[PDB]
Ligand binder design. Structure first.
Ligand SMILES: *[C@@H]1O[C@H](CO)[C@@H](O)[C@H](O)[C@H]1NC(C)=O
Lengths: 48, 49, 119
């Protein structure tokens, strides 16, 4: 099972992580049944 | 295969279903016949397992 | 194609014998097991007998010694000898065919023959 928990928080801090408490709700459980050992974030470029 | 052939030489389409019971989670399950809901009585409830 | 035809039905006296024939056309008679089934008017179907390629005949425990199943493979036919007819045997008879290398699905069916016993 691949559990994805997520939480959206409205913040106004400029640089670091804010200090507080916010429990993450379970969003989606995936029946994948596969081995995962590495991950990578996907970003977006800005073109002008 | 010809329409004039009798039974035994006619084309038969075969689909074979094989089940796997490995350590993977059982994604494939049978249909879930939900009955009506009865309140205020001592009943045997089965809610989502 | 596949076809089962029957003969021998009619209105007969009780205790007189009958010989019902089930001729098969379009398929090879071997490798299949043949059934005799009857249904009474107002009543459900009742199975009578089975016969195989070997010649092993199996009867219903409910009715004993009344019928005799006789297979013939030279001309692909099936015979039923009925003896000591009672008044309750008025029925529509069917010839059924099951495949020996599978489950007991009776596949295609005979059109049926009518047997009326009277005095
Ligand atoms: C998962 O992958 C890693 C690296 O490929 C391997 O060392 C590990 O044994 C694997 N685990 C399973 C359960 O296959």
């Amino acid at each position: 099972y691949f559990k994805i928990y997520s939480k959206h928080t409205p913040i106004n801090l400029v640089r670091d992580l804010p200090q507080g408490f916010s429990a993450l709700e379970p969003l989606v459980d995936l029946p994948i049944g596969i081995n995962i050992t590495r991950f990578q974030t996907l970003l977006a470029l800005h073109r002008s | 295969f010809q329409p004039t052939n009798g039974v035994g030489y006619q084309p038969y389409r075969v689909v074979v279903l094989s089940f796997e019971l490995l350590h993977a989670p059982a994604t494939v399950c049978g249909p879930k016949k939900s009955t009506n809901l009865v309140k205020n009585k001592c009943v045997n409830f089965n809610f989502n397992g | 194609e596949v076809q089962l035809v029957e003969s021998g039905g009619g209105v007969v006296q009780p205790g007189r014998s009958l010989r019902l024939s089930c001729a098969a056309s379009g398929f090879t008679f071997s490798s299949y097991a043949m059934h005799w089934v009857r249904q009474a008017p107002g009543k459900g179907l009742e199975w009578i007998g089975n016969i195989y390629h070997d010649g092993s005949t199996f009867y219903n425990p409910s009715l004993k010694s009344l019928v005799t199943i006789s297979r013939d493979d030279s001309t692909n036919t099936l015979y039923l000898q009925m003896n000591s007819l009672r008044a309750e045997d008025t029925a529509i008879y069917y010839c059924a065919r099951v495949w020996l290398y599978g489950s007991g699905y009776m596949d295609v069916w005979g059109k049926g023959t009518l047997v009326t016993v009277s005095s």
